[PDB]
Amino acid sequence: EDAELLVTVRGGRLRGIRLKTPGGPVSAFLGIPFAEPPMGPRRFLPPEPKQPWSGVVDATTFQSVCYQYVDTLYPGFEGTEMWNPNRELSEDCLYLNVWTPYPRPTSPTPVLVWIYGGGFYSGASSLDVYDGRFLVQAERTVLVSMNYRVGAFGFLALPGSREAPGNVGLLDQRLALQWVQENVAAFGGDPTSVTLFGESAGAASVGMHLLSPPSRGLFHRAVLQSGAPNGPWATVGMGEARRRATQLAHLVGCPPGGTGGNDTELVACLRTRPAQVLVNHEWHVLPQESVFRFSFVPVVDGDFLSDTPEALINAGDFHGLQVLVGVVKDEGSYFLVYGAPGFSKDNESLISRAEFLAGVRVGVPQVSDLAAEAVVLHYTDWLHPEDPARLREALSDVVGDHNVVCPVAQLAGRLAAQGARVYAYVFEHRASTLSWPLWMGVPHGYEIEFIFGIPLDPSRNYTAEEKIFAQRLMRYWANFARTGDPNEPRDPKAPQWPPYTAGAQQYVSLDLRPLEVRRGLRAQACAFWNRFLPKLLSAT
Amino acid sequence: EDAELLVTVRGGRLRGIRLKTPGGPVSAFLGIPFAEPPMGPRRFLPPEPKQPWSGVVDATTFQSVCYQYVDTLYPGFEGTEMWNPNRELSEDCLYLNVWTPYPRPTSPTPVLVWIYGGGFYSGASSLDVYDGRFLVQAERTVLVSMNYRVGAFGFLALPGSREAPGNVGLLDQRLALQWVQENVAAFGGDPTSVTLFGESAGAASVGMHLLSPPSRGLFHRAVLQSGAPNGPWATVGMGEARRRATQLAHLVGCPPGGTGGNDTELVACLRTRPAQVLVNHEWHVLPQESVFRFSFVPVVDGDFLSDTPEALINAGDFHGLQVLVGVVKDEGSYFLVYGAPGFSKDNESLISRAEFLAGVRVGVPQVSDLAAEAVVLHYTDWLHPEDPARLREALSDVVGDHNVVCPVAQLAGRLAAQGARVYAYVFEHRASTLSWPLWMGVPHGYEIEFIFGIPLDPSRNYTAEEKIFAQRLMRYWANFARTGDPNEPRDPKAPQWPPYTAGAQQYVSLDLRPLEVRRGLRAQACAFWNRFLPKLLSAT
Numbered sequence A, B: 001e002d003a004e005l006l007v008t009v010r011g012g013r014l015r016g017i018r019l020k021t022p023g024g025p026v027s028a029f030l031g032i033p034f035a036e037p038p039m040g041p042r043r044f045l046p047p048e049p050k051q052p053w054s055g056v057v058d059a060t061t062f063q064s065v066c067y068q069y070v071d072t073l074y075p076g077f078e079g080t081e082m083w084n085p086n087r088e089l090s091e092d093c094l095y096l097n098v099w100t101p102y103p104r105p106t107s108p109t110p111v112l113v114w115i116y117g118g119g120f121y122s123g124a125s126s127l128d129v130y131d132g133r134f135l136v137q138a139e140r141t142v143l144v145s146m147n148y149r150v151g152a153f154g155f156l157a158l159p160g161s162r163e164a165p166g167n168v169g170l171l172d173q174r175l176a177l178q179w180v181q182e183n184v185a186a187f188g189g190d191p192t193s194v195t196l197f198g199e200s201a202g203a204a205s206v207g208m209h210l211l212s213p214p215s216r217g218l219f220h221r222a223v224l225q226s227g228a229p230n231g232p233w234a235t236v237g238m239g240e241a242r243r244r245a246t247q248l249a250h251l252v253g254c255p256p257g258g259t260g261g262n263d264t265e266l267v268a269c270l271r272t273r274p275a276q277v278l279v280n281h282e283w284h285v286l287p288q289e290s291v292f293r294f295s296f297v298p299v300v301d302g303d304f305l306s307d308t309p310e311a312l313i314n315a316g317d318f319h320g321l322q323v324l325v326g327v328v329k330d331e332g333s334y335f336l337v338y339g340a341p342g343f344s345k346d347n348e349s350l351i352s353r354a355e356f357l358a359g360v361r362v363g364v365p366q367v368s369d370l371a372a373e374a375v376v377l378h379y380t381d382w383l384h385p386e387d388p389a390r391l392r393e394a395l396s397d398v399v400g401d402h403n404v405v406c407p408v409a410q411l412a413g414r415l416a417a418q419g420a421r422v423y424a425y426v427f428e429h430r431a432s433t434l435s436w437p438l439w440m441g442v443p444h445g446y447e448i449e450f451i452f453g454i455p456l457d458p459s460r461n462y463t464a465e466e467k468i469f470a471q472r473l474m475r476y477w478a479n480f481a482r483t484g485d486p487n488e489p490r491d492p493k494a495p496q497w498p499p500y501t502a503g504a505q506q507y508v509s510l511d512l513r514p515l516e517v518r519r520g521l522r523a524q525a526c527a528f529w530n531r532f533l534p535k536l537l538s539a540t
């Protein structure tokens, strides 16, 4: 037997597993507890560290997926099923994974910590696309991933109460970061160069940790992929959070028979309801029909987030911080088949002029009629105001800019001008195995497979140029984790990647072609969302 | 005893003069009185037809210019002085001029009636650039131009009173049009094919004759160069017209401090003041400092204009009408040196960001701060937000589109979509003799010298290809006056000039190169001024 798979951490001992990759073996430790299971009376409560265990915990397989909604829009379709849970759902789900090279590094190694996304209602570290055996084997780095509570189990907030304080799903991530500081050295990891990187709701969560003092001291670099904490979907006010939690309780029968309005009795009822009863009513508490809007998201409670994320970025000092931000080519196209009128993944979605006018009401919810008119003008080609193919591509840009691209460009612009060294990219490659239709372009979440070196898997049908492109993207992400710069540093033939400056606004395009530097992260479109639109609704 | 230079009309007898052109001789009749001199008691009143005269009226030289402000911004400068009066000022100015070919055409010939511009405060038919000896000799047409009262003498309005009804300057043009009907046949003209073309405020007057039923029966085709009746500067309501008229009186000493407020005794005072006293206080009645805004302009009284010009365009039927509209490449550049901050004729006019923000409030007067912010959002290059050269061209486009280009696009779109045949052009050539600086480009009013064949003058130093370019535009303009279609009737080799329609939006570019068809008359920019900005002002 091998002795590399037996590790002693502060809790106890673990037995790992040796996984095969085309280029070598990797040591994996899957299912490591970092918190007591938040079930029964611990539901909705902040996590507490795992009690030390006697004996050896079997860390040779993925643990359970946190309880969450399961996508049933297109059953049996690879594009949607690839993000659904691949393990049993359970409230017992606070387990983390560690990947380390073989043989174990003798010298301390940088640590990458992956925080998956999923609109704060879904996601798991067990997904095959999030497998980090190829990233660890190729770049010889320590990769850590964890499960955090999602949906109502992680973000239901009755603000001002001890039983449902909210943001407990983000506190799961912080506790998993504290576990890295205390235990990553046992796997050959360097706790003095931790690099947080997430995507979608995970990229927003990484931004939430930058704005929180207790979480700031647990990492040193950040990568945000298609997400930011200042997005319109990432947070919610305490008033709305109280209303959404109250309606969800009323939907499940709480409080019983017009009982007293204490928050103590309300949460007491929600702890007795089966886990699936809460999940079956997650989407019924949304205020209106919309896309890219979620029921239970992080709340500005004053504890974790002192102020709104928009305010904390404006007054924050970010010296000694390296940030890598980016977006895919067509961010908003993925969310249109989830409720926007006239859109289907099985045809071409050649929407009419009237459907485009209604898609803005769903894509940009809770805005005045005049505010919707400004959005219509800015995205309507008035030479062809009724071209179906142009209206379809235009509505994709409306959802993409409003939710992902423009909140990211403002974050990168404010980070660079306040001490941080920011690098920006734009993912422009469409994988040859993409099951989604052609008009979707480069949809949300489909750069993750290339970052995690999935094309290196022999069973997958990626092409030869995509495999080389996968190693190059891993090099960029790993180089940023070690030295804080995506460059080699010396190649010296590869075009350099210039940092994103608030004035020049430089970024690169990532595809099969070499690095091409561009200027402006959709400056003309985002100037409307970040500058003019706030004044439009502020002046009633 | 030359029979060609003696003509008997309804009023009496006229002796003309034979003028020289490099091609051939032309018979000109300059100074025909078509109305009684509006002096003394006839000041501010509609014109009366000229009494028949016993004898022979001398029509061998241009008559006096209507009293008007004289530009003293850049004295002794060819650019501004070429638009200043070349004859002595007098209220006795209602005279017209007729150019006819030599020998006189034995068959009826189409007539081209020319209306000068000048912001309704200046202008004259005696100007050298308005000489129609080359257009008549080369294309064998009949050119007629008149003098209409400008400034307060032609547009001061006290609505509700019979002493100062307003729009009297417009009636001077209609009376000259009735003179054409009764007398143009004596010069060889065809009152059945009368084409009415103007420029700037003259093009605005042409469009206002289209919306006046009595003036509708005096012409059959219309051309509007860099002007529209629906522009924000072309009309003023009755309420503001009474304010500007009464405020102008208070400056000249009327009413006699202090008589009653009835208009009868107020106009009685304004008729006693010398004409120059009325001109010296013309600009002192403007409510706000602004460019491309003029004191006394046509008023919506109900007699001449039943409703606002925009409302009349939306409801009128224009079947059987052929219209030629167009703008120059750089409309707003001429007006920037007339008050906009940081702009000078003698330097590069590299304005700062603060000067740009201040110039928008001058170019777009009397709009909300939120409305001004919307204007800054459109015309700012947010990738280079402080570039002085780009900010200069930006402010030149704001004034150009808001006042000229977009009001023309609204007319041409609603004319074609309601039965009228519309052709559109964009003049892009900058004359080699242009005394204005280079950053102005192709300024306002500098296509007129090419339409009138002035480059064919041997005393002027126009280039060889510019002379040929002048003969092209005269052919385009003459063919439209004869056939109703600009492109040559029998020439399949010359590129075709397609009609402008609401959906296609097709125009041509006029320069040294052959016709090049384009799509969209500033469609993206004009969508903001025509569609969105009205809604932004409705909710204040």
Ligand SMILES: C=CC[N+](C)(C)c1ccc(CCC(=O)CCc2ccc([N+](C)(C)CC=C)cc2)cc1
Pocket (backbone or CB within 6 Å): A073, A083, A117, A118, A119, A123, A199, A200, A201, A283, A291, A292, A293, A334, A335, A338, A339, A444, A445, A446
């Ligand atoms: C049809 C009815 C269903 N009903 C209930 C109405 C329904 C259900 C869900 C939604 C919102 C769906 C999203 O907003 C996608 C959110 C999302 C974000 C990221 C990810 N990755 C994990 C990153 C993978 C991205 C591909 C996945 C999903 C609308 C309606």
Ligand SMILES: C=CC[N+](C)(C)c1ccc(CCC(=O)CCc2ccc([N+](C)(C)CC=C)cc2)cc1
Pocket (backbone or CB within 6 Å): B073, B083, B117, B118, B119, B123, B199, B200, B283, B291, B292, B293, B334, B335, B338, B339, B444, B445, B446
């Ligand atoms: C320094 C003070 C001057 N003050 C009194 C303040 C002053 C005076 C005049 C103006 C308005 C000037 C214009 O809006 C140009 C109007 C115009 C338009 C067209 C033409 N063409 C005849 C077509 C020729 C164009 C080239 C001529 C003039 C503002 C301020």
